[PDB]
């Protein structure tokens, strides 16, 4: 089923290599676009596609966490002297092993003395004792990451095709990786080692990464990165995510539960006789009724196509830029001949919206339908088709066969507020075939749960 990608139309600059006190070469220069292909023959058709643009993720931090289901059972002791409900039994301690009860559950004890004698004697000052219980909710698991900090890599796809009796044959197929932050990077591409690919970036890549705490769900296994107030590994804010953390075994616990439990659990006696009390947790991100989540970055951030932990090793996260600037290529060889070829373009329909994202990115979130090759856009003044052109663009769809693709089109500041018309036309298409639509403009800017014990009192009088 071997097939070449749409060979884009690219101007080629002939440069001459400098010389030493020896034996008069030449270099073929061109600017390749992200998600487009370049084709040439050596005088076996050679193709290079700038497939992926990635910023690296690591700096370190990593920790699995969950969402806890909290339940607190208490008991009152009317006589302040009593052996039942004491500082040694309740203050800073986990309720000792039940032997039958769930392994997933995690409990902590808190001591509430100096009570009011309600349903008691006027002189004796009561005391309250509680078991705060925590278990994972819906078995929800997430990795917390201190997230992508850019290093930039380009991923190219080199394929050499041959036309053997009516059909194309993918002879050689490699993945080329080149670091974009330094000077030119050079390597051979073909097995014959005759040709060399030289990649050079103009400056920093189109878009940028924020430094902070991120996370995504785990399926017992990385997913689309989300952003919601989350704790750095060394921090333990109860109003932010990750205070309910998973250790090695898969057991979830409250981060420094023992010690902190008394600062976050607050209970007062309602009536010591009936064994009634007012209870709450001074925290967030717990069940019941204290947990929702932020949508993936992909969804909220137009400049982001995808942001995911790369694999099972959980060492790097890959941020795929919605679109990126072109890269500078030079193809060099001894002394022979190079000819560059190009295919043509087609387009059924399109859809999209003009967006200024939270990180101040002005782009056209374009989606093409049954399209291939070089596609030319024209952003118009007003909603009226035929109004004055304010920007002109060209997108390159790499699929040989007309397919549906989604892309990011950087726009100048002239493409200001309000809805407007945009007209797309493929290459060499008559102005009758030109699709127009009015496109929309969007812009992003920059409690007490009272319960009666239930378990009954074992110590009445």
Residue numbers in the entry: 12 to 34, 38 to 57, 79 to 255, 258 to 370, 375 to 487, 524 to 538
What wording appears in the published article?
Specific membrane proteins, called fusogens, are required to modulate lipid-bilayers and thereby facilitate membrane merging. The founding members of this cell–cell fusion family (FF) are the epithelial fusion failure 1 (EFF-1) and the anchor-cell fusion failure 1 (AFF-1) proteins, both of which are named after their respective knockout phenotypes. Both proteins have been shown to be sufficient to fuse cells in vivo, and induce fusion of insect and mammalian cells in cell culture when expressed ectopically. FF-mediated fusion appears to be bilateral and homotypic, that is, dependent on the presence of FF proteins on both fusing membranes.
The consistency of EFF-1 proteins on the more spherical vesicles allowed tomogram sub-volumes to be averaged to produce a 3D reconstruction of membrane-anchored EFF-1. Our 3D reconstruction reveals that the natively membrane-anchored ectodomain of EFF-1 has an asymmetric elongated shape. It is ~13 nm long and the region most distal to the membrane (‘head’) has a cross-section of ~6 × 4 nm2. A narrower region (‘tail’) leads to the membrane. The ectodomain of EFF-1 observed in the crystal structure is in the post-fusion trimeric conformation, whereas the native membrane EFF-1 structure determined in this study is monomeric. A protomer from the EFF-1 crystal structure was first fitted as one rigid body into the determined EFF-1 EM reconstruction and gave an overall good fit with a cross correlation coefficient of 0.497. To further improve this fit, the protomer was subjected to four iterations of flexible fitting using Flex-EM25, with each domain considered a rigid body and flexibility allowed only in the hinge regions. Our structure and the fitting unambiguously revealed that domains I and III are distal to the membrane, and that domain II is proximal to the membrane. The flexible fitting of the domains yielded a ~16° rotation around the domain I–II hinge relative to the crystal structure and a ~19° rotation around the domain I–III hinge. In this conformation, the distance between Glu 245 on domain II and Lys 400 on domain III is substantially shorter than in the EFF-1 crystal structure (reduced from ~12 to ~4 Å), suggesting a possible electrostatic connection.
